[PDB]
């Protein structure tokens, strides 16, 4: 009877080694995949052609064909290995310092047993990995995705691949998606998955507390944080060709991702109810991290002033411009310690989006569509928002300056 009482302590005293396996897998894989050819025979005939940058190429052309057969665990392990290789600010050659030193000691042991080096930066490892065809891997892996875990790891790998303004690899994404006559499936996989996620929020998590260890979100709503990040990174710098291709694909069927993204933004935080008044009931500490991401994603669709995406956001049928307007005029009803340092960023991103809509237009219709909602109380809004600085980037005075610039543009 003491066996049961003791093997719990036994398995705890074994699982305390949870970190050495992590450091023995990630670094010990990424260093050998970075330099796979040395000490083989150290010859010229059989090795100089097998790797000229063509071993990971071999692996990634092979592993795209094993989704159709069984054992999807191997594919997602390949994906997570490539993603752990893909990032940086890790693996460079008192419970937070002894672990690091014994981990680097153990990987040092393994690399000296396993072994004019050209140092690779992040800006060129993405180009090196794309040139052998890593963009094709994800763009075919989510086009014909079978499982649900494959999609999440694939979009995470795509996010780690893009990583800001790498226009050399966004060119690959654009120069594949406008061919092969079946990219409508690629857009459909995003469109239906974002359509079913906004249905789950309208049914299950739709509550309010009319009063004065967490309910964790569903796997279909939390999956849109990397979806919106990947859509934001696809038109990162300005990307004129990829800002219109997300709205019309010139196919037999076309999915407007901007319109449904605004629909999701509208429905996540009190559709048709927040635009007239209260919206702080729909906002809490576990929801702002997605509203910030969708606000940034709609900000990226309009900058680099394409006049089509700005007309689509302001003038489409389910009027979601009334709620990005609403949350900078009125105040959020709950107030707390971790509320001011989130509502500042929320109002700042909303004001930045409203500035992005009116960037350079000289057009009356989209201005009066904005002006149809509020009365001209932006002056008292910026006055109050300026005197909120009196008791003492993301600072309270710059926000009111953004609304002042917007009101100056609307005053003509």
């Amino acid at each position: 009877r003491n066996i049961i009482e003791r093997l719990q302590d036994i398995v705890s005293a074994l699982e305390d080694r949870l970190r050495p396996l992590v450091q023995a897998e990630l670094s010990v894989l990424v260093d050998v995949l970075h330099r796979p050819e040395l000490l083989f025979p150290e010859n010229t005939d059989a090795r100089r052609k097998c790797e000229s940058g063509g071993f990971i190429c071999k692996l990634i052309k092979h592993t795209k064909q094993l989704l159709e057969e069984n054992e999807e665990k191997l594919c997602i392990k390949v994906l997570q290995t490539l993603r752990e290789m893909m990032t940086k600010d890790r693996g460079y050659g008192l419970r937070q310092l002894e672990d690091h030193k014994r981990g680097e000691a153990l990987r040092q042991i393994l690399v000296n047993r396993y072994y004019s080096r050209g140092e690779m930066s992040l800006a060129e490892v993405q180009c090196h990995l794309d040139k052998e065809g890593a963009s094709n891997l994800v763009i075919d892996l989510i086009m014909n995705a079978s499982s649900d875990r494959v999609f999440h790891e694939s979009i995470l790998l795509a996010i780690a691949l893009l990583e800001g303004g790498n226009t050399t690899i966004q060119h690959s994404f654009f120069c594949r998606l406008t061919e092969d006559k079946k990219s409508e499936k690629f857009f459909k996989v995003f469109y239906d998955r974002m359509k079913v996620a906004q249905q789950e929020i309208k049914a299950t998590v739709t509550v309010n507390t009319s009063d004065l260890d967490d309910l964790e979100m569903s796997a279909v709503i939390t999956i849109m944080q990397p979806i919106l990040r990947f859509l934001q990174l696809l038109c990162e710098n300005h990307n004129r060709d990829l800002q219109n291709f997300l709205r019309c694909q010139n196919n037999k069927t076309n999915y407007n991702l901007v319109c449904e993204t605004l629909q999701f933004l509208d429905c996540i935080c009190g559709s048709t109810t927040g635009g007239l008044g209260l919206l702080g009931l729909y906002i809490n500490e576990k929801n702002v991290a997605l509203i910030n991401q969708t606000l940034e994603s709609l900000t990226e669709y309009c900058q680099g002033p394409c006049h089509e995406n700005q007309n689509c956001i302001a003038t489409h049928e389910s009027n979601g411009i009334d709620i990005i307007t609403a949350l900078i005029l009125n105040d959020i009803n709950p107030l707390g310690k971790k509320r001011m340092d989130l509502v500042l960023e929320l109002k700042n991103n909303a004001s930045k989006l409203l500035l992005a809509i009116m960037e350079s237009r000289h057009d009356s219709e989209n201005a009066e569509r904005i002006l149809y909602n509020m009365r001209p109380k932006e002056l008292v809004e910026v006055i109050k928002k300026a005197y909120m600085q009196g008791e003492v980037a993301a600072s309270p005075r710059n926000v009111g300056h953004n609304i002042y610039i917007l009101a100056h543009q609307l005053a003509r």
């Binding site: 309010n208 009319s210 559709s271 048709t272 109810t273 007239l276």
Partner: protein
Amino acid sequence: SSFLHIGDICSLYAEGSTNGFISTLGLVDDRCVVQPEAGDLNNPPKKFRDCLFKLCPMNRYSAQKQFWKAAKPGANSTTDAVLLNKLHHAADLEKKQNETENRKLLGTVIQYGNVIQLLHLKSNKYLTVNKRLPALLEKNAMRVTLDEAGNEGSWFYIQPFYKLRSIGDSVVIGDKVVLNPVNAGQPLHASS
């Protein structure tokens, strides 16, 4: 041109195991009833005005459901003149923009697979169903009723009884269709 539009005034007829028009006994009562002896297509019942229905588009009961749930105090009894008042205002205005957009769909050919929102003309009450409480005379896949408010769950899918037609095909006058609600998932049945 011999199609069925939004805003038409039709009269649903039952045929199969039992025959007859779908009527409604009384006006203080909310029971939907078919009766075989009243009449058939060759000669309708004398009180034919009871059997008429009107075709209506989507009505969105989103803020109305929230207001009805908030205005019924279960165990908190928190009545606010600053919260329930603006909830009532929100429900009223969205009902106003709900009714003012039905006039924009006033002429529109319906196709199979749409929402149909049946409205009784005499009682001015929608034909609804809810999935939680069974029928009176029977158990096992619940009854239908009527109410003025437009209950959520009054949406019906219009589906063909014949495979001559398909989803997306227009609905012509005089064909036999089958109606099932979107959230109940069971076709509306005339009992015996």
